[PDB]
Amino acid sequence: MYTFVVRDENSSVYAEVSRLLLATGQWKRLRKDNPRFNLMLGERNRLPFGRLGHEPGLVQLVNYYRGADKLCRKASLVKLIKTSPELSESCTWFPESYVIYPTNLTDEREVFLAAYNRRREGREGNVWIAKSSILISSEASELLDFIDEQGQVHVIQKYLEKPLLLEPGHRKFDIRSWVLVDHLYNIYLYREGVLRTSSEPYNSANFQDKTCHLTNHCIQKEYSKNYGRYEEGNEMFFEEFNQYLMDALNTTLENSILLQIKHIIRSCLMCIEPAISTKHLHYQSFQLFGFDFMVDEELKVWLIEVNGAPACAQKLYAELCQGIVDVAISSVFPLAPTSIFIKLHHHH
Amino acid sequence: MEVIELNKCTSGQSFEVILKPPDPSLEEIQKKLEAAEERRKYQEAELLKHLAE
Amino acid sequence: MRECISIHVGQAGVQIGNACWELYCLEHGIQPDGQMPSDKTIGGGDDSFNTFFSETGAGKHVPRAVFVDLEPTVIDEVRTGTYRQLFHPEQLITGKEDAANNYARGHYTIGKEIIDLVLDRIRKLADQCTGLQGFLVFHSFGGGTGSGFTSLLMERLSVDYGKKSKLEFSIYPAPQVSTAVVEPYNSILTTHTTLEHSDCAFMVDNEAIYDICRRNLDIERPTYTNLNRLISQIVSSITASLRFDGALNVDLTEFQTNLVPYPRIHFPLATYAPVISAEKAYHEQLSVAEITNACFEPANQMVKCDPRHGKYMACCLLYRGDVVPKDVNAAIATIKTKRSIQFVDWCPTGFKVGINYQPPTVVPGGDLAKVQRAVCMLSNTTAIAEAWARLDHKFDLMYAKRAFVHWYVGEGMEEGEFSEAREDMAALEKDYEEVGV
Amino acid sequence: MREIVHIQAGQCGNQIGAKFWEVISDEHGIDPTGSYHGDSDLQLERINVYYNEATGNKYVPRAILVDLEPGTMDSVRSGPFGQIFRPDNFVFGQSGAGNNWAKGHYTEGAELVDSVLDVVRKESESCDCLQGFQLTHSLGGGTGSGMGTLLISKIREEYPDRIMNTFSVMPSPKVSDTVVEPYNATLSVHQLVENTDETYCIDNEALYDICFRTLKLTTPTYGDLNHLVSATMSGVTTCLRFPGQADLRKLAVNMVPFPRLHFFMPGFAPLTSRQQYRALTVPELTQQMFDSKNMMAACDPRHGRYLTVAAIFRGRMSMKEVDEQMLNVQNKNSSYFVEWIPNNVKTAVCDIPPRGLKMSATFIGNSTAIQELFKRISEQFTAMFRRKAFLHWYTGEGMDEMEFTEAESNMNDLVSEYQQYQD
Ligand SMILES: Nc1nc2c(ncn2[C@@H]2O[C@H](COP(=O)(O)OP(=O)(O)OP(=O)(O)O)[C@@H](O)[C@H]2O)c(=O)[nH]1
Ligand SMILES: Nc1ncnc2c1ncn2[C@@H]1O[C@H](COP(=O)(O)OP(=O)(O)CP(=O)(O)O)[C@@H](O)[C@H]1O
Ligand SMILES: Nc1nc2c(ncn2[C@@H]2O[C@H](COP(=O)(O)OP(=O)(O)O)[C@@H](O)[C@H]2O)c(=O)[nH]1
Ligand SMILES: [Ca+2]
Ligand SMILES: [Ca+2]
Ligand SMILES: [Ca+2]
Ligand SMILES: [Mg+2]
Ligand SMILES: [Mg+2]
Ligand SMILES: [Mg+2]
């Protein structure tokens, strides 16, 4: 009889995993503070990694990688890419970014302005976006002043002015990929992604109205008037998107986009493996990641960010959560296909 | 990667490599010990009083 | 030459001390009868090994050691054991009933009645010293004597030997080899009262030693003898610089200067490699790079924690055996490009290296195989705060219900000492976080 | 040299005590004449814990036999090992206690108690370093219950910092000599709450059910019950009589988190009926040891929570497999262990097994489920006290009703204290 504890009541993903675990009849849920557990579904913030793996005879597993925050933080990701030789400052799939600390608090203000002034002089498009852990503008003055009005670290990265627009609609979108890393650091890409589409026509001459520029599911369902017009819940899945790429662009989702997505996932996760691997640790970790990508009109894939506590598409909860149990939990605590994941092989 | 202060002798050697630059008094202890003894004496006295009753 | 006095308190301190002095004698060529044929100066001398051994007119080399326990069964092993002839009776101090795993019983009730005698015996050893450096104190956190009497002894030592350094070798409690539930209480109580009196403390978590014995030595259920012989190898690596010719860590003061820039954060992490089973027919001799790389694996640390998620304040590499500086620097360069070694911005990113050409000595019939080269890394990392957090958490669980508190109050301790000690530990955890994040 | 002084009082106390000394004398290789004839040095390593060494290499139990009538101690002196006890350590009157706590505590017992203390003092004076005392008695009678608790009170007055341990047999209407047993047991329990450091609660109802249901004895006798008590007493004192860890005070420190909650439920395995030669595996030993049917307090552990648990394994077995099974019982039923005492389940192993068994396990639990035992006694007490029934036996000895009402409230307070830690 295996034992687990639930320490994040707000996780829709691991509420289903917990539901599945109990349904097997071979897992028992303890009080959240009971130290005699095999599996911890930990809290998002300040997870007590230091107390794991010190119960005699208990093989203990947790659903988060200590140190994975370096990848799942706005400013942290930028610093990681610029300072890690595996990714380098010339990384071709990450938008030119800069970490800007508000003046009321290293910082990259002067470096940003230098590159900003260069684009302005060369007639090039100079539209940046400021965000933290949102404002879109082409004037450096407005971007820096907006950050000083806040008190948290922000990042300024280039705004993809030439995004791939779906038709009909002429509308922006982004691609969410769910990736699972087990205790052995196998990288599993869920076969099912989701396109979070904008239900408004993309307008390049008005960044003030952010409805057609931000493809967040919450913004479209609150400030967009065409929500659900083209696809239910502004969510297009790979089957429809692949069929579209073939009909419109005479190409496939695997060739035009997925190869780059798999390459980006591997690069990011392999880069931090020595820092977060639990191979020789007194406890074991796995974690579910949400990678967000942008695709431009040239079919080049750009990484936008990585989410360390992602939610899932309503239609895909059952399949993904069961997969988490099969490859992440039961592989360590076996019970008494055609896998839904794509293993991204790599050198350890 | 610099080495400094290399010292050698018959039984070994030592050096330094730089990869990058940047109470209660005796009286007070007695009081604490005696205060604890007094507390034990008081607790034992109360027990004996309880048993005498 | 400057002398060092070793003090062993309680069962853990005594049994570990017994294993250490057994090893010291083998390393210096001293026989169980105390004779040392290699020592050509009969009756005296100021050689490096004389920091730990005095000499009688008859040529006997006597450890500068005192053993103290409230129950005699552990120390009776010394009085009749192999090395019974090394110590004279004045050095072995035993009572009749122990502190019952009760810090307050060892510190107050019993400590008050035996402290003066223990200091007198220590004074007799000090009177034999021309320039006493200080003391090395071995004890458990969990025992009533190891925790309670040690803290009282350390307080009196600061009074009677103000200018003398004091180092600790402390056994951190692990339920796998413990039958006492109150050890978190005792550990926090003794750390609070000893913190201001200890210049540098080497904590050894029984959980780490236990798993190294099972994993590397293929011992299914290690005994205290298995644990102590491994611990004594690590202790020997740490104190070798005091007992052999050299220029690194040559006196107790140097341990603090090299390992402790901030006085309260004085708990360096020890990591030792290689630990090879003697039952193996023949093992591939590991290189300098390989044993150095092993110093950054959690599996060979004396306290299980993750130094990848802390900051370093100091790092010292102590090699024994066939090692030349060329290969050390080559290994360090390789590890920097592969490991996550982050120093605090106010400390230099460097390593102090000591090499002793004499490889590790293995006790005949022990569990450890003879190796051509071994290394002990001493790093002052904030990652060891994980061990304080673990211990403080168990404390909080029991103290919230006042479980077992009456045993301590019954010995004359005020309940307020619990919260005073716990708040001190909270301040210690805050100091670590301020430096490491 | 951590000596223990053993006292046995009244009929039950002396009959169980006699069997205890017969069992451990066999384990230590001591014959009925006090002469050692074992074959293992482990038999003598800690022999002085319970035996004094007389001239001629003779070992004499450090035992004091007390009663208010001569009958039972005459049987002991004529029993198997009756000749092994010190003749001067027999202290007895002629009046009897009439199953009356007041006679044992205030009148008949009061006239004899000073002479018992003289023998206790004599034995204590010849101890290198006395650990404490252990008393065997029943709570339902008059001598063991009334005079036994009187003795405990006077021993605590003279030896206030020594550990006092008891094996206390709790009465049951299923195995009853007289109807006043709940009166005597309620009066005694308050004394135990105040004046002992550790009490092993042995319920005659649990002993009966074990003999009848598990051992398949059609007509259990007091002798059959005492066989279980002997085996249990040997099990829980193994860690005192052989090399290990250790002493009564250390045991108390790790078993008793709150001073009044010092009443333990003991258990034993195996309990086999005559399929008796079959080898018993570690899993079987561990599963039975935690089974309610193997426990002797007649309380359902699954009705409360374990504050602390000690388990002793005897015999040449796999200590690796012991830890795996122990860690399996906890990590499979952690809902019955309080989560605010970390690592509150301790395991110890002893190489010497009990006579006739390849291996065995003894269980010592400090469980809040023991409140069920005190609740049963309290309800039986009140059913009679509500009508002042049989009180004249006690008022005739000078007791007042107010002392009964105070004992009633004292034990209900104790029940209330267990209930708060069970939630
Ligand atoms: N490594 C190691 N740990 C030990 C040894 N002996 C005891 N311990 C540990 O020390 C703790 C118990 O404290 P002890 O040193 O035995 O107790 P003490 O200092 O003699 O104090 P009291 O017996 O209570 O008076 C437990 O955590 C044990 O695991 C030993 O020989 N080696
Ligand atoms: N450099 C850039 N160029 C173009 N669009 C961008 C961009 N950076 C962000 N966006 C837009 O912003 C949206 C999401 O922004 P971002 O992911 O930084 O905020 P967020 O993290 O709160 C949403 P989530 O974490 O759920 O993916 C995307 O739909 C994308 O279209
Ligand atoms: N287990 C057991 N219980 C007994 C024995 N003799 C008496 N009892 C119980 O003890 C109580 C009677 O007390 P008893 O010891 O005979 O009275 P005393 O001589 O005045 O102390 C009743 O609850 C009996 O069931 C015995 O030999 N074994
Ligand atoms: Ca000499
Ligand atoms: Ca000092
Ligand atoms: Ca009379
Ligand atoms: Mg995000
Ligand atoms: Mg001890
Ligand atoms: Mg009777």
Side-chain angles (χ1 to χ4, degrees):
Chain A
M1 181 67 62
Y2 301 110
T3 61
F4 71 100
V5 294
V6 171
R7 294 172 69 85
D8 185 354
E9 302 286 351
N10 297 328
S11 171
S12 52
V13 167
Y14 292 96
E16 176 65 1
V17 172
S18 180
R19 198 278 298 185
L20 291 177
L21 295 176
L22 295 174
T24 63
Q26 311 176 28
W27 279 86
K28 186 178 185 297
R29 172 173 174 172
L30 312 175
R31 301 187 206 88
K32 60 199 309 173
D33 300 321
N34 189 325
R36 291 198 173 284
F37 59 86
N38 294 118
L39 171 65
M40 165 179 293
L41 308 182
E43 54 269 69
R44 302 183 189 91
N45 303 117
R46 309 197 61 85
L47 195 164
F49 293 100
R51 299 211 305 262
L52 300 173
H54 299 283
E55 287 298 334
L58 281 189
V59 183
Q60 296 192 310
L61 179 71
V62 64
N63 68 329
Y64 279 96
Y65 265 98
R66 188 184 190 183
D69 50 312
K70 269 63 181 179
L71 195 69
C72 305
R73 247 66 180 184
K74 299 292 198 303
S76 304
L77 179 58
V78 178
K79 174 183 176 181
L80 178 66
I81 296 179
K82 291 186 174 185
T83 63
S84 297
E86 293 80 24
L87 313 181
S88 74
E89 191 184 42
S90 60
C91 168
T92 64
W93 43 257
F94 186 75
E96 184 182 3
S97 303
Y98 297 93
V99 180
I100 296 298
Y101 289 78
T103 58
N104 55 277
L105 278 57
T106 57
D107 187 74
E108 294 175 332
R109 271 179 178 264
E110 291 185 345
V111 182
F112 160 82
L113 301 179
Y116 175 91
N117 299 322
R118 172 175 293 180
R119 285 186 166 273
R120 164 172 293 192
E121 182 187 15
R123 293 300 91 99
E124 294 182 342
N126 215 12
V127 180
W128 304 78
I129 181 180
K131 49 187 176 180
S132 64
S133 299
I134 290 71
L135 171 59
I136 307 177
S137 180
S138 57
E139 298 301 338
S141 60
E142 301 177 355
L143 293 179
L144 294 178
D145 292 338
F146 171 78
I147 302 182
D148 302 332
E149 299 168 343
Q150 300 299 355
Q152 59 286 358
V153 182
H154 278 66
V155 296
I156 298 182
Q157 70 175 185
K158 187 64 179 59
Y159 185 79
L160 303 179
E161 308 181 30
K162 294 183 175 182
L164 180 64
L165 302 182
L166 303 175
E167 300 294 356
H170 200 68
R171 46 206 185 94
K172 190 177 182 178
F173 73 92
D174 73 312
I175 295 178
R176 158 64 60 88
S177 294
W178 293 281
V179 177
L180 180 65
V181 182
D182 65 9
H183 64 296
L184 300 181
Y185 221 83
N186 295 324
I187 306 176
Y188 295 103
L189 169 62
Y190 185 23
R191 74 159 80 109
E192 296 289 5
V194 304
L195 284 67
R196 291 170 291 182
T197 66
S198 174
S199 51
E200 304 295 346
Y202 181 79
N203 191 95
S204 58
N206 179 18
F207 307 94
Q208 185 175 358
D209 186 357
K210 302 175 298 179
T211 297
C212 74
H213 295 275
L214 288 63
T215 63
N216 297 317
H217 189 287
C218 61
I219 301 179
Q220 298 295 322
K221 194 172 183 179
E222 270 294 359
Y223 304 98
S224 180
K225 300 184 179 183
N226 288 328
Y227 179 81
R229 178 185 182 182
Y230 311 92
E231 46 275 333
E232 186 177 6
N234 291 18
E235 296 183 331
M236 178 184 299
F237 293 89
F238 280 5
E239 186 179 357
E240 179 181 10
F241 184 50
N242 180 77
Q243 188 65 223
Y244 171 84
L245 295 174
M246 296 184 301
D247 297 336
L249 289 306
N250 187 19
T251 188
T252 72
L253 175 54
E254 168 66 30
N255 288 4
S256 65
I257 291 173
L258 214 69
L259 275 178
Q260 295 166 85
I261 284 183
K262 291 182 289 185
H263 169 71
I264 301 174
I265 297 173
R266 288 182 51 187
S267 304
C268 290
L269 290 171
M270 287 179 60
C271 173
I272 62 182
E273 178 173 3
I276 72 173
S277 167
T278 64
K279 181 178 179 181
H280 303 290
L281 213 55
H282 42 290
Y283 71 88
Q284 296 301 319
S285 288
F286 67 93
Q287 187 174 346
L288 175 67
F289 296 95
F291 287 76
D292 297 338
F293 299 94
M294 278 284 299
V295 188
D296 66 16
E297 66 188 6
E298 291 299 283
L299 294 175
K300 173 182 180 176
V301 172
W302 301 84
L303 173 69
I304 300 302
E305 73 155 3
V306 187
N307 296 270
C312 187
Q314 171 62 0
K315 183 187 65 177
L316 307 177
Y317 268 105
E319 191 181 36
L320 179 59
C321 292
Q322 175 59 45
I324 294 181
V325 171
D326 291 356
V327 307
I329 302 177
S330 297
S331 61
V332 182
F333 312 97
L335 302 177
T338 301
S339 176
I340 67 172
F341 297 103
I342 308 172
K343 181 180 178 182
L344 312 184
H345 291 85
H346 70 278
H347 302 173
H348 307 279
Chain B
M1 192 64 176
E2 181 191 17
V3 172
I4 65 173
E5 291 185 356
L6 178 61
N7 291 121
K8 304 173 65 184
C9 67
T10 290
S11 55
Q13 52 182 312
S14 59
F15 61 96
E16 183 180 12
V17 52
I18 298 184
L19 306 179
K20 182 200 306 178
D23 295 326
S25 64
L26 180 65
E27 160 200 14
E28 298 170 335
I29 297 174
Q30 276 294 315
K31 300 171 185 173
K32 295 179 182 174
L33 295 176
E34 289 174 347
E37 183 176 43
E38 210 58 14
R39 284 188 290 275
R40 289 194 308 275
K41 292 179 176 176
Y42 178 87
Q43 299 175 34
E44 176 164 323
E46 293 296 329
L47 172 61
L48 296 182
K49 187 199 314 297
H50 187 75
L51 288 171
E53 294 162 356
Chain C
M1 186 278 306
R2 303 192 65 206
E3 302 83 344
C4 297
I5 294 174
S6 294
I7 305 175
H8 313 272
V9 182
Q11 174 176 118
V14 173
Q15 298 196 136
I16 289 169
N18 211 27
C20 288
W21 288 98
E22 177 192 33
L23 181 55
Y24 291 168
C25 288
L26 293 172
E27 293 182 356
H28 296 294
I30 297 173
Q31 303 173 6
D33 66 339
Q35 297 290 322
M36 184 180 181
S38 67
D39 183 0
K40 302 310 173 187
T41 44
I42 304 296
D46 53 356
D47 289 315
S48 286
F49 64 88
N50 287 123
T51 61
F52 277 60
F53 295 88
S54 62
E55 304 183 22
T56 73
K60 175 182 293 184
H61 299 60
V62 184
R64 305 185 193 272
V66 173
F67 296 70
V68 188
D69 202 1
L70 308 189
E71 167 225 2
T73 62
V74 181
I75 286 180
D76 280 341
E77 305 290 12
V78 182
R79 297 193 177 109
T80 59
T82 297
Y83 294 86
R84 58 183 174 275
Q85 293 184 111
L86 290 191
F87 321 88
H88 41 262
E90 287 75 15
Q91 304 175 263
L92 312 180
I93 314 176
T94 58
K96 298 198 172 182
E97 68 182 347
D98 58 38
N101 287 339
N102 185 335
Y103 171 96
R105 194 171 175 88
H107 182 101
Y108 294 98
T109 310
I110 301 176
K112 180 178 182 290
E113 303 300 329
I114 200 168
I115 181 61
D116 290 322
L117 169 58
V118 172
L119 293 181
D120 186 83
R121 302 297 172 84
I122 298 177
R123 177 64 62 186
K124 284 178 179 174
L125 285 181
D127 293 340
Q128 300 182 68
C129 299
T130 61
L132 173 65
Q133 302 186 46
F135 307 90
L136 308 185
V137 184
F138 301 73
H139 64 102
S140 67
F141 276 178
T145 302
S147 68
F149 181 74
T150 297
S151 76
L152 177 62
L153 176 60
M154 294 281 286
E155 285 182 302
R156 289 293 297 273
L157 288 181
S158 296
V159 177
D160 294 4
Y161 304 84
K163 299 297 178 58
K164 276 60 173 60
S165 297
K166 298 194 292 298
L167 282 60
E168 287 180 277
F169 295 87
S170 303
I171 304 306
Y172 177 105
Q176 270 181 319
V177 298
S178 167
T179 54
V181 185
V182 292
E183 288 185 84
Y185 282 171
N186 300 336
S187 306
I188 282 179
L189 291 172
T190 194
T191 296
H192 165 58
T193 57
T194 307
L195 201 54
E196 282 299 59
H197 301 282
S198 185
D199 305 293
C200 185
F202 299 104
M203 282 195 300
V204 171
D205 186 349
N206 265 348
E207 174 193 87
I209 304 300
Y210 190 85
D211 280 332
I212 291 173
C213 288
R214 297 203 298 185
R215 191 191 328 105
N216 300 32
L217 298 181
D218 298 340
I219 312 288
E220 303 204 55
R221 212 306 176 176
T223 64
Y224 280 143
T225 301
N226 300 131
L227 304 179
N228 293 344
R229 289 214 166 106
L230 172 54
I231 296 175
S232 57
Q233 293 290 333
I234 283 67
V235 169
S236 169
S237 293
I238 298 174
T239 69
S241 58
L242 306 168
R243 299 177 286 113
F244 293 92
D245 192 1
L248 172 69
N249 293 340
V250 66
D251 60 23
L252 297 181
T253 294
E254 191 163 348
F255 285 85
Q256 174 274 323
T257 290
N258 290 335
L259 299 170
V260 189
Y262 271 63
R264 278 177 63 88
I265 315 299
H266 63 238
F267 302 89
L269 179 68
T271 310
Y272 187 86
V275 177
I276 301 294
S277 173
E279 299 304 324
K280 284 194 170 188
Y282 246 113
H283 194 79
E284 332 78 45
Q285 282 308 292
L286 296 180
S287 68
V288 173
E290 289 170 339
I291 66 172
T292 304
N293 181 24
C295 289
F296 299 84
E297 285 293 344
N300 21 252
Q301 300 167 359
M302 291 309 100
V303 182
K304 284 187 180 181
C305 60
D306 198 340
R308 298 176 297 177
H309 299 106
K311 285 193 173 185
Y312 287 85
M313 282 163 280
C315 193
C316 187
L317 290 165
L318 304 171
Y319 293 88
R320 303 181 73 165
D322 185 52
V323 178
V324 297
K326 169 183 57 184
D327 294 328
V328 176
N329 293 328
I332 292 181
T334 293
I335 292 182
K336 277 299 303 177
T337 60
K338 283 186 168 60
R339 297 290 188 171
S340 300
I341 306 178
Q342 278 289 322
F343 274 76
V344 299
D345 290 322
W346 45 275
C347 289
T349 301
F351 306 88
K352 288 190 177 65
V353 179
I355 299 170
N356 187 320
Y357 297 144
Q358 185 172 309
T361 300
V362 291
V363 181
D367 305 304
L368 305 182
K370 185 73 174 186
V371 301
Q372 275 304 350
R373 61 190 59 91
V375 62
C376 181
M377 188 173 76
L378 305 174
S379 62
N380 195 336
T381 297
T382 59
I384 207 170
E386 301 177 26
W388 297 126
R390 300 159 50 203
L391 202 58
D392 289 336
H393 185 66
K394 290 183 178 179
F395 181 109
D396 293 338
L397 290 172
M398 290 189 295
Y399 192 66
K401 311 288 186 298
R402 298 307 190 266
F404 305 98
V405 169
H406 69 285
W407 286 109
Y408 297 73
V409 176
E411 298 288 357
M413 195 176 84
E414 304 190 90
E415 202 180 72
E417 182 159 352
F418 277 96
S419 54
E420 189 190 84
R422 182 58 181 90
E423 298 176 19
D424 193 11
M425 297 302 304
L428 185 67
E429 289 195 66
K430 187 171 180 176
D431 294 334
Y432 275 104
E433 194 172 1
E434 298 187 11
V435 183
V437 197
Chain D
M1 315 178 192
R2 35 188 68 168
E3 293 82 17
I4 290 176
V5 172
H6 167 95
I7 307 171
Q8 51 190 62
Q11 180 166 33
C12 179
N14 276 281
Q15 296 182 155
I16 291 178
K19 298 295 299 181
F20 168 78
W21 285 104
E22 175 174 14
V23 174
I24 69 165
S25 290
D26 175 70
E27 298 185 1
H28 292 280
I30 305 297
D31 70 358
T33 59
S35 297
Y36 171 83
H37 290 283
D39 62 337
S40 176
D41 300 330
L42 296 71
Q43 289 175 301
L44 302 180
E45 185 110 16
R46 311 248 281 186
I47 196 68
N48 62 3
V49 174
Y50 282 93
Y51 296 85
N52 292 320
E53 202 166 334
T55 308
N57 200 19
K58 289 286 186 177
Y59 296 96
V60 186
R62 196 175 299 101
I64 305 167
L65 301 76
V66 182
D67 206 340
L68 286 172
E69 65 192 15
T72 299
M73 284 169 50
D74 286 351
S75 296
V76 176
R77 189 181 304 109
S78 302
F81 287 72
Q83 306 289 318
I84 196 184
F85 297 105
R86 200 180 190 273
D88 292 325
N89 287 20
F90 291 74
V91 188
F92 57 95
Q94 301 290 328
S95 62
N99 288 283
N100 187 320
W101 193 87
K103 287 195 172 193
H105 206 84
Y106 292 122
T107 56
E108 304 297 341
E111 187 176 358
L112 187 71
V113 68
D114 278 357
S115 57
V116 174
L117 293 172
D118 286 336
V119 176
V120 170
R121 189 173 311 102
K122 182 279 169 190
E123 288 292 357
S124 295
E125 293 179 354
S126 66
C127 290
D128 181 26
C129 186
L130 175 77
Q131 295 192 46
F133 309 86
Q134 69 176 35
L135 166 74
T136 61
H137 63 156
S138 71
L139 306 187
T143 300
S145 192
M147 195 189 175
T149 55
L150 182 67
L151 284 167
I152 290 172
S153 195
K154 300 200 181 304
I155 285 177
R156 196 181 179 184
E157 189 175 18
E158 184 168 354
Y159 306 89
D161 66 351
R162 301 295 89 187
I163 295 295
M164 174 65 68
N165 195 358
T166 75
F167 299 87
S168 303
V169 174
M170 311 282 178
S172 160
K174 312 302 182 54
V175 188
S176 171
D177 295 336
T178 69
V179 296
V180 293
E181 283 160 5
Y183 282 160
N184 303 326
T186 294
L187 292 165
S188 278
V189 167
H190 177 55
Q191 302 298 307
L192 301 179
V193 170
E194 280 197 356
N195 292 326
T196 77
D197 299 289
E198 298 167 303
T199 286
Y200 294 96
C201 295
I202 303 168
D203 187 312
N204 263 357
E205 179 173 8
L207 296 179
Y208 171 76
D209 290 334
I210 293 171
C211 291
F212 188 93
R213 304 184 202 181
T214 300
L215 298 182
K216 300 307 182 184
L217 300 173
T218 301
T219 304
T221 71
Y222 277 133
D224 294 324
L225 280 45
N226 297 344
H227 177 75
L228 294 180
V229 183
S230 305
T232 300
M233 292 183 64
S234 171
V236 304
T237 62
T238 291
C239 67
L240 307 166
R241 301 184 285 109
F242 298 97
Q245 297 171 353
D247 72 328
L248 292 174
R249 186 171 292 107
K250 268 194 185 178
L251 166 68
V253 163
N254 289 302
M255 287 294 292
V256 187
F258 309 102
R260 291 183 293 286
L261 310 187
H262 60 254
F263 298 87
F264 304 155
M265 306 192 335
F268 186 83
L271 298 167
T272 308
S273 58
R274 293 180 172 90
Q275 288 293 342
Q276 47 180 137
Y277 311 106
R278 169 187 173 183
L280 199 60
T281 59
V282 174
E284 294 177 327
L285 259 191
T286 306
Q287 301 181 264
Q288 306 181 201
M289 178 183 50
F290 281 94
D291 192 338
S292 61
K293 305 198 305 297
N294 289 68
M295 301 200 184
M296 297 165 185
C299 300
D300 193 334
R302 307 175 76 98
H303 292 180
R305 310 193 73 187
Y306 288 113
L307 304 170
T308 56
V309 172
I312 302 78
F313 290 78
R314 304 184 63 180
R316 306 176 64 255
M317 68 189 70
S318 167
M319 187 172 300
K320 161 192 175 65
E321 192 176 33
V322 173
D323 299 328
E324 294 181 348
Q325 296 298 331
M326 287 303 296
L327 302 178
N328 178 272
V329 175
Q330 314 174 34
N331 308 331
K332 289 183 63 62
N333 312 279
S334 59
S335 54
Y336 304 112
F337 298 84
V338 301
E339 73 288 358
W340 38 272
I341 298 178
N343 314 115
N344 56 339
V345 184
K346 293 307 176 185
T347 299
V349 183
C350 179
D351 294 322
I352 296 176
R355 181 64 93 105
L357 297 187
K358 292 293 181 66
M359 57 184 57
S360 62
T362 298
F363 170 94
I364 310 172
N366 189 351
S367 164
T368 67
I370 197 64
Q371 70 165 295
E372 292 183 334
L373 181 158
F374 299 121
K375 281 182 180 178
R376 289 196 304 269
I377 301 297
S378 183
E379 287 175 349
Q380 297 159 15
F381 174 103
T382 298
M384 294 186 295
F385 187 63
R386 289 186 48 175
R387 301 289 289 263
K388 304 178 175 185
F390 306 98
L391 283 187
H392 73 98
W393 298 127
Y394 299 81
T395 62
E397 305 301 314
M399 284 183 75
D400 187 78
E401 288 186 359
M402 183 63 75
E403 185 164 345
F404 280 71
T405 301
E406 298 173 347
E408 184 180 41
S409 306
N410 288 335
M411 199 161 66
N412 290 336
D413 288 346
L414 181 64
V415 167
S416 300
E417 190 175 353
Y418 280 110
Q419 180 57 34
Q420 71 176 100
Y421 291 115
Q422 182 171 318
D423 311 328

